[PDB]
């Protein structure tokens, strides 16, 4: 399971992400994880390999977005080392924005 600090980011900003590594019993396991970050058309731009052993199943990591970037939907994909065919994924967006000051609900 992959948690990101935001669901959408700016060019030139930092993405903070924690990967929780559990077994089938949802209990923390210590294994080596292969994580990849892919572009909108599916090009891996940054990849990692790390074991969560003795870290209580938590992999806190970081990466900086360059300003030279194609805006759109970006995907993080991850899989264990001993199970490469079981691929997990979650998505986020890159755009040029400032935050609004109010919310609109359509009911």
């Amino acid at each position: 399971f992959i948690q990101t600090d935001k669901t959408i980011y700016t060019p030139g900003s930092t993405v903070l992400y924690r990967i929780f590594t559990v077994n089938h019993k949802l209990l923390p396991v210590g294994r080596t994880v292969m994580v990849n970050i892919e572009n909108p058309e599916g090009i891996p731009v940054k990849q990692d390999s790390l074991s969560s052993q003795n870290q209580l199943g938590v992999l806190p990591l970081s990466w900086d977005i360059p300003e030279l970037v194609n805006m759109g939907q970006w995907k993080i994909r991850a899989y264990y080392e001993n199970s490469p065919q079981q691929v997990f994924s979650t998505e986020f967006e890159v755009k040029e924005y400032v935050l609004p000051s109010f919310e609109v609900i359509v009911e």
Binding site: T7, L56, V58, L99, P100
Partner: protein, 107 residues
């Protein structure tokens, strides 16, 4: 478990920007907790792909090997639809299954 996050203070509603406040965290003994505090205006822009506990149990239910809410065509169909194998010394045993996924309903 049961992780709850609440306010330590009981008064001074809507605190001032920069003010110190007490974050109270009740939870299971021995647990490690991770935190992130986000402006809601990020979520008004994009609230997709937010992780929650209900989606975790939804992922586990999608990984279930049982395909039917009980019963079966016979004793062998009861175990096979539940997700179990049986084999006896007399000869009675479950049906062969070579597919990981569940058979699709006609719909």
């Amino acid at each position: 478990g049961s992780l709850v996050v609440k306010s330590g203070q009981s008064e001074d509603r809507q605190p001032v920007p920069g003010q110190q406040m007490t974050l109270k965290i009740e939870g299971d003994h021995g647990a490690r907790v991770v935190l992130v505090a986000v402006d809601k205006g990020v979520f008004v822009l994009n609230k997709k792909n937010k992780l929650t506990q209900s989606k975790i149990w939804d992922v586990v239910e999608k990984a279930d090997i049982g395909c039917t809410p009980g019963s079966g065509k016979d004793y062998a169909g009861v175990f096979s639809d539940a997700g179990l194998t049986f084999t006896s010394s007399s000869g009675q045993q479950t049906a062969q299954r070579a597919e990981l996924q569940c058979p699709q309903p006609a719909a």
